[PDB]
Structure formats: structure tokens, C-alpha cells
Amino acid sequence: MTEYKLVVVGACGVGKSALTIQLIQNHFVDEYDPTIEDSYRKQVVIDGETSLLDILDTAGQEEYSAMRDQYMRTGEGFLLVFAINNTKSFEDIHHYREQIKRVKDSEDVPMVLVGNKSDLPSRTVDTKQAQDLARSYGIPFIETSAKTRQGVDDAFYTLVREIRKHKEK
């Protein structure tokens, strides 16, 4: 089977860990230690084809690291996560994409825009803004809630679809 390195990126508190733990362990974690950066394995069937996923849940400090760069370069696809009640995290999306392209020689890197915390009524980022941003980048946009599990499989599955499309090229 094919094996892909996925990387979950985005600002502190957007739900990177909650999304990943939901996918792997099927429960919602409310106070996940923000210093733990770990990877998880999962075998999945998507569009009738099995892939092994190696998923890195990023953390660390707001700092440049040449070693982090090295790890990020090995990623084959990225989830760009923001929270719909956090305008800063949405503004940050552009900068995460800039860093991904930087470390991967400006390749047309497989990416999915993820609007997490879609269960909350406290929205500050309009869906149209997110759709327009994904459109400009030529990437899918998926709305998720790690809390309710809405769209969690979809977000990761869609990223695998993007990697598959890219590796045909």
C-alpha cells in the first residue's frame, strides 16, 4: 500500500491535536498539553484504495528551527487549520502556506484549508472568506468540529485525495 506523511499545522489553540486524536482514537480531548508534538500511524481506505498515513501533529514555539524545516520538508501534504472564532488564526493561514512552500522549494504542495470549531455559534471568520482564500490557493476547504467529529474524516481523506492527484503529476 501507499504511505503518506501528513502534517497538521496552524496557530496555537485551533484544534490540531483535537482533530488528530479524534481521527486516531475517536474521542475529543479538551485540555491537550500544547507542548506535545507527536506522530500517529493509521491505515485508511479512501475511494476504495488503502493508504498508510503517518500524521505529524505540530507544536513548539513561535520560532524558526532548521530542524523543524527538515521535518516539514518531508511532509507530503498539509492541513492548514484555523478556528472560525479566531480571526488571527485565519490571518495566519497565509503565513503557514508561505513557510510550507519555502521549505519545499515552492512545489505545488498538497494542502487542505480546515475551518475547525464549526460547532461554535461565536464565528468571526465568514465562510465566504475561507472559501475565497481556498479558491485563490487552488485547494479544498473543509469545515470541521473536533468536538462533534463533523468533517474530521473528510478533512484527512480530502488531503489524501490531493496527495494522490499531485503524485500522478
Ligand X SMILES: Nc1nc2c(ncn2[C@@H]2O[C@H](COP(=O)(O)OP(=O)(O)O)[C@@H](O)[C@H]2O)c(=O)[nH]1
Residues of this chain that bind ligand OHY (CB under 6 A): 9, 11-12, 16, 34, 58-62, 64, 68-69, 72, 92, 95-96, 99-100, 103
Among ligand OHY, Ca ion, ligand X, none, what does residue 75 contact (CB within 5–8 Å per kind)?
none
The verdict on 18 binding ligand X (CB under 6 A) reads yes
Sheet holding 38-46, edge to edge: 38-46, 49-57, 2-9, 77-83, 111-116, 141-143
The whole-angstrom distance between residue 3's C-alpha and the CA centroid of its chain comes to: 17
Q: Where in 103-162 is the site for ligand X (CB under 6 A)?
A: 116-117, 119-120, 145-147
The verdict on 30 binding ligand X (CB under 6 A) reads yes
CB of 121 to ligand OHY, least distance (A): 24
Determine the angle formed by the axes of helices 152-168 and 16-25, rounding to 10 degrees.
Answer: 90
Say how many residues make up the chain.
Answer: 169
Among ligand OHY, Ca ion, ligand X, none, what does residue 62 contact (CB within 5–8 Å per kind)?
ligand OHY
Using the minimum distance from each CB to ligand X, give the nearer residue, 51 or 142.
Answer: 142
The Cα–Cα gap between 168 and 109 comes to: 13
Instruction: Give start and end residues of each alpha helix (H) in the chain.
Output: 16-25, 66-74, 87-103, 127-137, 152-168
**Residue ranges in contact with ligand X by CB under 6 A:** 10, 12-18, 30, 32, 34, 116-117, 119-120, 145-147
